[PDB]
Amino acid sequence: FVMWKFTQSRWVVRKEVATVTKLCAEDVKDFLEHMAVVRINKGWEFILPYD
């Protein structure tokens, strides 16, 4: 689901993923840290640019 959200849009909200997937905060954080970085006022951005 996280990878699909990243394919649909470059910016992913952590709270939306936590609400949809019904998962705890730490699992969503580990899922995001593997492929995203925290950008202030924008959420989570994919670590690599569009190739």
Tell me which residue has tokens 């470059």: 10
* Closest by Cα among 13, 17, 19, 14 to 1: 17
Q: Which of residues 9-38 bind other proteins (CB under 8 A)?
A: 14-15, 18, 22-25, 27
Closest approach of other proteins to the CB of residue 8, in Å: 19
Neighbours of 36 (CB within 10 A): 19
**3 vs 27 by CB, closer to other proteins:** 27
Q: For binding to other proteins (CB under 8 A), which residues are involved? A: 14-15, 18, 22-25, 27, 40-43
